[PDB]
Symmetry: D2
Subunit: 285 residues, 4 copies
C-alpha cells in the first residue's frame, strides 16, 4: 500500500485545512500523519500530510491533477510525492571529504532515502583518496575566475541530464553565481562552521582556539545570492574543552559540519522542510 | 484574542480531519497549530488543534456544544479549553521533597501553567523543612493498613471541594486503591526511577552501584491499578560514572525524577498528551 | 574525616606532579581524585587534587605553609581549601530575577554549596517577587552616570564587611568600572546570551527571529575590563524553532542564561576552574 | 616526538602518585595529561598518564623494564604503549552488519585508530553488502551445536597468527564458551540493546512497542562467563515515540547499538578504560 506526502505553503486564509482534508477524504484517501503551522507574523500557512489509499486507489498523477485545482485557488506552493520515490541528489565537493564520506555512509546504511546522481568537483578525482564510489559517477569540471559561466553551464546540463532534484554543497568552495543560486532555490543545501561568538577574518579556528570557546557549531542552509546567508534548515553544536588543540578544533568542526548537513539532508529528503521567506518551517521528529 | 486547544482520540475512519477542520472553518475559527496521528496498529486517530477567532468570535461553551455533535458521530474522547485557563493541580508527597520543590519552582518562574490547589501528605507538615508554601495549603491526611478507605475519601472530597483537574504523585509512597486509580484515569501522574538493566528487589541503588551502570533513568506515567506500570508519558536518563558513590546515585536519581516529572507535567498542562490504551501519544 | 582540594597553575617544567604528590605523601595525605593537564601551546601546567588524611591528620594552615615552599620554587598560582568550607557569594541583579531565582533554588535544594551573603540590586526590593530570598539580606544600591564611584564604594565595603569570596552578576545590567573588574579578577562571574551568528544594535531578538535561527546560546565568564569578554567558563545552547515568537526567544534566552550561569557557578564552587590567561581550564 | 600512555590499577596505598610521577620525572619524561581516581569502596586506585620525552629520549622497552620494578612493588595491573601503535582488532559479525559498517566507516575516516586484522563470521561473504570491507581479510567460520570447539580453535588460531590485541563482537550472535571468554578477558567487547524496563521471551520488540516506551538503550561491555553481563564500558539511549512501529524499534535499536559500541571501542583504543572488578573506570573528556 503506497504512502504519499504532501507539503504546502500559502497566504493565511480561513479553511485551508478544511479544503485539503476534504479533498483527500472525497478522493478516498486516509490521513496517517499530519502537521499544520500558521506563521501569524509572515501571514503564511504551512502543512505536511502523509496519506494512503482507503476507499479509492488513485494514482499520484491523478491526485496531483486533482489537488492542483485547490493549490491554484489558495495560491499554494506545494509538492506531492510517493514516499517510496527517492530524490535524485548531486554532491558537489572541493577538497574536504568529510561531508561527502558521511552522506555516502548514511545513504549506504539506509538513513538517507536518496539516489546519488553524481559526485561533482572542481578538482581532479585523484586528489580524493580512500573512496570507491561504485556506480556513482565522479565528474571533474575545472573552473577559474574567467570560466565560471562555462563550468556552471556544464553542471546545469548534468543536473538536467540526470533529472537531479537536490544539489548538496558538501564543502564545495566555489561560489555559485546569483543566477545559478536563483535556479536552485529551495533545491541546494550548503554547510558551514559557526562559532559562539562569531569570528570574522583570517584563521577563524585559531581565533576560536585563542578565545577559549567551549563549543563549535555548524549551520546547514538553502543557498541564495548572499554568501553563507540563505534560509537556515538546521544548526547544532558540539563540546570544545581546554584539551582541544587547533588540530582538534578542525576535526571537531568537520564532525559537527557532517552531522548537521546529514541531518538537514534527512529533513529535506523526508519532506519536512518548507521555505518561509528568509526562514524555514521544519516539522521535526 | 483568546486561543483554544482541542484534543481528541477516536476509532480511525475516513474524514475525521475534514469533519473537525470544517467545523472550525464554518464556525469562523482559524487554525494556528495542529497535529494529527493515525495509530494504524490500534486503529485510533489522534488530533491536537490550537485555534482562535477569525470571522466569528464564538464563546467556548457554544463551540463545545457544537463540537459535541461531531464527537458523538465519530465516538470521540475529547477536550476543548481556553489556553489561558490554568488547570487546578494537587501535589501528593510523603518524605522526599525534590519533585515537590522542582514543581513549585517551575510554577513560580512561569514554566508550568497551573494553579496548585493543595499539597497533601500522609506525613505531618513539620517533617518537611525549608518550605514556604505561601497561599497553597498543606493537608496532613494520616493513613495505615486499616484506614485507607477513610483517607482516600478525605483526599477525594478535597479534590471535589477544590475542583482539582490533576493529581501528581510527587514521590507519594502510599498505593492508591484500584477504585481511586479508576476515578483518576488520565488525571493522575506518577514518577519512578528506572535502570538499564532493571533491578528488582531490595536496595536497587546499591545493586546499580555494584553493577557499574553508566546511566540512571526515570519514568513518568499515568496511574492505573498495575503498581508503577500505567501509560508512559515521558522517560529520560542522566549519566553515572565510576566517581559516583551510592549517595551520588541517590542524588542523581532525584535529579532525573524531578526533571522527567516536571517535563511530563508540562506536556500534560500544554494539552500535548493523549491516552492510547496502555500507551500515550505525545505531540512534542 | 575532611577532604581538601588543591588547584594550581604554573609554567610547565618536568617534575611538577612528582613535587606535589611527594609533598602530600610525605605529609601523610592520600589522593582521592586528581587531574593534570599540560597546555603545550602556552607552556603552562594545571592540577586539581582532592585528598584527605591517611597516616597523619595535619591542619589546613600547616599544609598551606609547607606547600608554599613548593609553590615558590615552581612559581605557582594556587589555592588549597577544605571542601566543607562554603564560599561566601554575593549576588547582583537588575530588573530580571531569572538567574537569581535559579541560583537561590539550586542553593536551597543542596545543588550549590555556598553561603549567600547578600542580594544587591540597582533596583528596589518591590521589583522582585522575593521567592527563595528568605533571610538573605537585600540592599538597594542605586546607580547612574554620576554616582558610579559611590555605588561601587558601597559594594566594595559590603564585600569586605561580609567576607565575600565571589560576586555573581545574575544578569546585572550596569557596567562595572575598570578598577572594580581588576579588584574582582577571577572572583566575578557574568552571564550573557547570544546566537549563531550574534546580533548587534536595535532590537536583537527581532534580528534573531528574522534570521530564523534554530539555536540560542549563553556564555558564562570571568569579568575583565573588556565589556562581556573575559575568560569563558561555560557555554551551552538550547533549541529554537519556527514556532517561537520574539517573546519566546526572550524566554528561552533567560532559560539558557540561568542554566549556563548555574552550571558555571557550580564548577567554580567545586574548585574545577583554573584561569589560563584569556582562557580557562575546567576539570569536568 | 612520540607520546606514550600508561594506565594502571592497584590496591590503594599512600604514595602511588609520588612513585609513578617520580619514575617518569627521574627517567626524563614530561606529563602531558593525567588522571587519578581512588575507589574507596573497592580499595583500589586508578591512573592514566600520557607523557613524552623531556631530558632523556628513552625507548618504550626500557621504560617498561624500569616501570615493572614499581609495578611489582605496588601489585599493579598496568599497560604502557606508544599512542601511535595501532591495536590489531578482529571484528566478529553474524547476520546484521550495522555495528561492523559503523566501525569500518569510523576507521576509514580517522575516528578509530586501529588495524583491522580480519572480519570473521558464522555466515558467508554473500550475506554482506561489503561496503568499506576493502582489502580486510574475510573468513566464514561456520558453527553449530556440535562444532563449537573446532570453530573457536580456528578463531583462537587466527588471533595468534594475526597478533590480534582486541576482539569486537559486532552483534555476533553465537555465545562464546567459558574458556574462550576467559582467554579474551579485558580484550573482547560485546554490545546489546535494551529498554527501560527490559523484556524477555518471544517477540521482545513487540513487547517494547506494546509497553509504549519513550527510550531505547544499548550497553557495551567486556565479555565474561555470564551471558551479556560483564563489565560495562558505556551505555546510552535514543528517543522512541508513538510514531515508531516495531520495525522502527529494530532500526533504532541498531542505531543505538552501533553508536554505543563505536564509542566504547574508541575509549578502549584511546587507553581510557580500566577494569574495576565487575565494573570499569572510564577516564572521559
Amino acid at each position: 500500500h503506497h504512502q504519499y506526502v504532501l507539503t504546502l505553503s500559502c497566504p493565511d486564509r480561513a479553511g485551508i485545512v478544511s479544503a485539503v482534508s476534504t479533498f483527500l477524504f472525497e478522493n478516498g484517501q486516509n490521513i496517517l500523519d499530519a502537521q499544520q503551522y500558521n506563521d501569524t507574523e509572515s501571514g503564511h500557512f504551512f502543512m505536511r500530510v502523509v496519506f494512503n489509499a482507503a476507499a479509492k486507489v488513485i494514482p499520484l498523477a491523478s491526485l496531483r491533477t486533482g489537488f492542483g485545482v485547490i493549490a491554484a485557488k489558495f495560491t499554494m506552493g506545494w509538492h506531492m510525492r510517493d514516499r517510496e520515490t527517492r530524490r535524485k541528489v548531486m554532491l558537489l565537493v572541493s577538497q574536504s571529504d568529510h561531508c561527502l564520506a558521511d552522506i555516502l555512509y548514511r545513504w549506504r546504511v539506509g538513513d538517507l532515502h536518496m539516489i546519488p546522481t553524481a559526485i561533482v568537483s572542481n578538482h581532479p578525482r585523484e586528489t580524493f583518496s580512500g573512496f570507491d564510489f561504485g556506480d556513482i559517477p565522479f565528474y571533474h569540471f575545472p573552473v577559474n575566475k574567467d570560466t565560471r559561466r562555462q563550468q556552471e553551464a556544464a553542471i546545469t546540463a548534468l543536473i538536467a541530464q540526470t533529472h537531479t532534484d537536490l544539489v548538496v554543497l558538501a564543502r564545495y568552495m566555489q561560489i555559485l553565481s546569483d543566477e545559478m543560486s536563483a535556479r536552485l532555490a529551495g533545491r541546494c543545501i550548503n554547510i558551514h562552521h559557526s562559532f559562539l561568538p562569531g569570528f570574522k577574518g583570517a584563521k577563524p579556528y585559531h581565533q576560536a582556539f585563542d578565545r577559549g570557546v567551549k563549543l563549535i557549531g555548524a549551520t546547514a542552509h538553502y543557498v541564495t545570492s548572499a554568501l553563507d546567508e540563505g534560509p537556515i534548515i538546521d544548526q547544532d553544536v558540539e563540546r570544545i574543552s581546554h584539551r582541544d588543540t587547533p588540530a582538534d578544533l578542525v576535526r571537531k568542526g568537520r564532525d559537527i559540519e557532517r552531522r548537521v548537513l546529514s541531518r538537514a539532508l534527512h529533513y529535506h529528503l523526508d519532506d519536512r522542510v518548507i521555505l518561509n521567506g528568509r526562514k524555514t518551517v521544519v516539522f521535526t521528529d
